[PDB]
Subunit: 314 residues, 2 copies
């Protein structure tokens, strides 16, 4: 079973860490943070890792039921939510995953919409249920953010119209804020079981092992509810690569696949990258910022090489 | 290049007409409406049709710029926005498509979020987002002309001339006055105008057969209802067929719905060249089967092939 990547262009790819299109390829060699995201994690032979799952709609989504309303001391409104697996089955905290698959993998205030469709139906309404939806924010750094224990909180403003004991969906849309008090850091993991407990079953950290190489990211810009900023979310591989690798189940013949970013119109290789077995890219680049490349481009598998292979500089 | 389908199970598939997971397989033999949706349209040899595009994030999304606030007889505040292609390039109305790719393909009040990130800039741009509704049956819904209208709940906090994104979430309502009908196309160029460049209607050509849909339930902002959106093929099938670009060897591919755990075929279906499924079923409602099931290509057959009843 030979190894292949999708032939989708950048404009045909989506982010595996938030429901966003891919905007640009991106590098940042001088990043000081450990890169250990948990969504968009898949080995080249198709083994999903971390909290990664296959649905584009599952990324940073939650399903469950609300239990109680609680206010904070700053007069904001919060709602306790028990969470299930995205497919509705109970989350088993002893499952060998960091958190329910799809759980956000970064610190911040995630903005979206909470919606509910009641289980009980009304005969006079054609045996149909009542519904409600509201804007909501989930603070993944909150001590109440404990998805591995089956419970999280979300916050709303100016509404009491959230029902307990009714099926609840969180649809992510963007970030609430990226100001200092909103604690946005795309490389800081949540404490999935709370502050004093160690995260478990994590996908491994990734890094270049070679002098002169840096990580290559698929970058998306993420919407903001308000305030100032131009926040971005960087993934190691787009969601369509996760879907492809999973289905193909091709044995990895070495620790590193050589790949070429090609202009199919000219047939020319624009640059080379190392696609590592654990599912991430490195390139020989000494600068930060976007990679300027034609819109028809995509990565193509060339051959299996090894860690000592020297990439041509970008 | 032999023909293949993805090996993704039902619980690993998403809808091609709204950003939702697939919940169930579904039939409705006695449907009176012409089925002619424009998203999730792809021939078996990988030709996208209608307003279909490849991004899961592009389905029922819009990109553009708000131009001005508008007043009308309805509550809430209203706004005009120009719409571009999803990749930001100007929409060319002479493109041989019904509307910008990703445009909603049904009548209703689509509920979502409008967000903005200003162009001009500390040196960081300003932002805002609000819940919004787009009435696709409205005379002001003219995406083929490069313009649509949306409504917000009372707020003035929407800026003119700034990059604007619509993220779909569900429906605002399904009451009679909200005109939800998943098989009624919008008038893409406005009232009294003919739609153009449409993907063709689909139907069973065989007695006793009916369409088979991939069904998703869609969230509601309020009111009573359990609305659903039915697609002909999931978004991952569109992605797979597009890339595979495999020649269709007949008008119909015979496919088997398999339980991979047991290896047994639960039922067979016809996968038609234009990109839709039919089955031999004489009832409406969900197909009750484990979510780990999936379709597998069996062989190329013809219009005269007789399916075993489900």
């Amino acid at each position: 079973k030979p190894f292949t990547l999708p032939i989708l262009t950048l404009g045909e790819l989506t982010n595996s860490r938030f429901p966003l299109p891919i905007d640009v390829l991106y590098t940042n060699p001088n990043e000081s943070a450990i890169v250990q995201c948990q969504n968009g994690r898949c080995t080249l032979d198709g083994e999903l890792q971390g909290t990664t799952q296959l649905l584009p709609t599952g990324i940073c989504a939650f399903r469950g039921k609300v239990t109680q309303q609680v206010q904070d001391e700053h007069r904001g409104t919060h709602w306790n939510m028990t969470v299930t697996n995205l497919n509705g089955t109970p989350f088993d905290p002893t499952e060998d995953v960091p958190a329910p698959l799809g759980t956000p993998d970064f610190s911040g205030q995630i903005y979206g919409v909470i919606s509910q469709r009641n289980t009980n139906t009304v005969p006079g309404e054609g045996n149909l249920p009542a519904n409600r939806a509201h804007e909501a924010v989930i603070a993944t750094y909150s001590p109440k953010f404990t998805p591995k224990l089956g419970n999280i909180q979300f916050s709303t403003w100016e509404t009491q119209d959230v029902s307990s004991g009714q099926p609840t969906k969180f649809t992510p849309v963007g970030l609430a804020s990226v100001d200092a008090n909103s604690h946005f850091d795309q490389w800081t993991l949540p404490s999935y079981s709370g502050a004093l407990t160690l995260n478990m079953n994590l996908a491994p950290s990734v890094a270049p092992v070679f002098p002169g190489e840096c990580l290559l990211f698929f970058r998306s810009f993420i919407p903001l509810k308000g305030g100032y900023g131009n926040p971005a979310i960087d993934c190691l591989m787009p969601q369509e690569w996760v879907q492809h690798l999973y289905q193909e189940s091709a044995p990895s013949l070495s620790d590193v696949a050589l790949v070429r970013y090609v202009n199919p119109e000219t047939g020319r290789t624009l640059f080379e990258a190392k696609l590592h077995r654990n599912g991430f890219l490195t390139v020989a680049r000494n600068s930060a910022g976007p990679v300027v490349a034609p819109t028809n481009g995509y990565f193509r598998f060339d051959s299996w090489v090894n860690q000592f292979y020297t990439l041509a500089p970008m």
